[PDB]
Design an enzyme around this catalytic site. Sequence first.
Site, PDB file in Angstrom:
ATOM      1  CD  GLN A 197      -2.719  -2.868   7.500  1.00  0.00           C
ATOM      2  OE1 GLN A 197      -1.890  -3.756   7.292  1.00  0.00           O
ATOM      3  NE2 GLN A 197      -4.020  -3.083   7.444  1.00  0.00           N
ATOM      4  CB  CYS A 229      -2.619  -6.348   4.971  1.00  0.00           C
ATOM      5  SG  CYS A 229      -3.839  -7.620   4.536  1.00  0.00           S
ATOM      6  CG  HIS A 271      -1.735  -9.223   8.441  1.00  0.00           C
ATOM      7  ND1 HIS A 271      -2.317  -8.034   8.065  1.00  0.00           N
ATOM      8  CD2 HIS A 271      -0.467  -8.923   8.812  1.00  0.00           C
ATOM      9  CE1 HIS A 271      -1.439  -7.055   8.194  1.00  0.00           C
ATOM     10  NE2 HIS A 271      -0.309  -7.566   8.645  1.00  0.00           N
ATOM     11  CG  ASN A 289       2.747  -6.343  10.568  1.00  0.00           C
ATOM     12  OD1 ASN A 289       1.906  -6.262   9.669  1.00  0.00           O
ATOM     13  ND2 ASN A 289       2.434  -6.727  11.802  1.00  0.00           N
TER      14      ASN A 289
HETATM   15  C1  LIG Z   1      -5.286  -7.580   5.601  1.00  0.00           C
HETATM   16  C2  LIG Z   1      -5.194  -6.368   6.514  1.00  0.00           C
HETATM   17  O1  LIG Z   1      -5.447  -5.249   6.044  1.00  0.00           O
HETATM   18  O2  LIG Z   1      -4.838  -6.543   7.691  1.00  0.00           O
HETATM   19  C3  LIG Z   1      -6.607  -7.509   4.801  1.00  0.00           C
HETATM   20  O3  LIG Z   1      -7.692  -7.937   5.628  1.00  0.00           O
HETATM   21  C4  LIG Z   1      -6.541  -8.486   3.645  1.00  0.00           C
HETATM   22  O4  LIG Z   1      -6.470  -8.100   2.476  1.00  0.00           O
HETATM   23  N1  LIG Z   1      -6.528  -9.764   3.996  1.00  0.00           N
HETATM   24  C5  LIG Z   1      -6.431 -10.849   3.033  1.00  0.00           C
HETATM   25  C6  LIG Z   1      -5.643 -11.999   3.663  1.00  0.00           C
HETATM   26  C7  LIG Z   1      -4.868 -13.007   2.822  1.00  0.00           C
HETATM   27  C8  LIG Z   1      -4.742 -12.590   1.349  1.00  0.00           C
HETATM   28  C9  LIG Z   1      -5.507 -14.381   2.978  1.00  0.00           C
HETATM   29  C10 LIG Z   1      -7.806 -11.344   2.600  1.00  0.00           C
HETATM   30  O5  LIG Z   1      -8.683 -11.564   3.432  1.00  0.00           O
HETATM   31  N2  LIG Z   1      -7.976 -11.544   1.294  1.00  0.00           N
HETATM   32  C11 LIG Z   1      -9.203 -12.043   0.677  1.00  0.00           C
HETATM   33  C12 LIG Z   1     -10.427 -11.188   0.978  1.00  0.00           C
HETATM   34  C13 LIG Z   1     -11.542 -11.493  -0.014  1.00  0.00           C
HETATM   35  C14 LIG Z   1     -11.849 -10.276  -0.899  1.00  0.00           C
HETATM   36  N3  LIG Z   1     -12.257 -10.647  -2.259  1.00  0.00           N
HETATM   37  C15 LIG Z   1     -11.574 -10.347  -3.365  1.00  0.00           C
HETATM   38  N4  LIG Z   1     -11.186 -11.316  -4.190  1.00  0.00           N
HETATM   39  N5  LIG Z   1     -11.545  -9.094  -3.787  1.00  0.00           N
END
Ligand SMILES: *[C@@H](C(=O)O)[C@H](O)C(=O)N[C@@H](CC(C)C)C(=O)NCCCCNC(N)=[NH2+]
Length: 215
Positions: free
Chosen positions: A19, A25, A162, A182
């Site tokens: 990535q 992610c 993540h 991953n």
């Molecule tokens: C993961 C990465 O690239 O390492 C990346 O930070 C990511 O998308 N993380 C997610 C983790 C899980 C889904 C909990 C994350 O943080 N998602 C929510 C972020 C909030 C963003 N808001 C929306 N709804 N667009």
Amino acid sequence: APDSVDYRKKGYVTPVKNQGQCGSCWAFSSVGALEGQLKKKTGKLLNLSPQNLVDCVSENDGCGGGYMTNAFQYVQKNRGIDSEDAYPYVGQEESCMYNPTGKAAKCRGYREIPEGNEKALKRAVARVGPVSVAIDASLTSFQFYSKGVYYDESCNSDNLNHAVLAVGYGIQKGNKHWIIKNSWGENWGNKGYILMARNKNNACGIANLASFPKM
Ligand SMILES: *[C@@H](C(=O)O)[C@H](O)C(=O)N[C@@H](CC(C)C)C(=O)NCCCCNC(N)=[NH2+]
């Protein structure tokens, strides 16, 4: 459900991707699940476009983060997601450039696994295939993992950060684990994979935010 199942041995998993310096992610987690179902349905295993997601899912924030569920909905409403070739990953957010002639897959929804229920996660993997999951990958032990069944009591079930892919499950030397793909390249972990603790009190929140698409 079998005691062990590795979808890699079934040819449901594409090679490990990287990535890069983009918080995509959720896109890579989403794409992996769809690639698994495309295989189950058509018998072909192709690389789907995480970039298509990054640039086109307005409910998500591209390299700023997002959710796999929003990604599946986008694919469902869009009525298709391009292949990696028709939409190369650049690792930067750009305007949506979806090309329908590059459409490699479609989606008709998604199913969520009950929060914290690892038994449900298991039942789902053995029946559907690779499932998208969120975990807490902030610990430095996770960062430097190279072998064995990973488990660190400092992991936070309530600090999911993540998005990753549950590609199977089994047991090593007496220790039950999840086979996790991953998106930090091959040079990471064990050739891009990690064996995470299964049935050890929802290790790292592994079964708190899981889902998969329907076709
Ligand atoms: C993961 C990465 O690239 O390492 C990346 O930070 C990511 O998308 N993380 C997610 C983790 C899980 C889904 C909990 C994350 O943080 N998602 C929510 C972020 C909030 C963003 N808001 C929306 N709804 N667009």
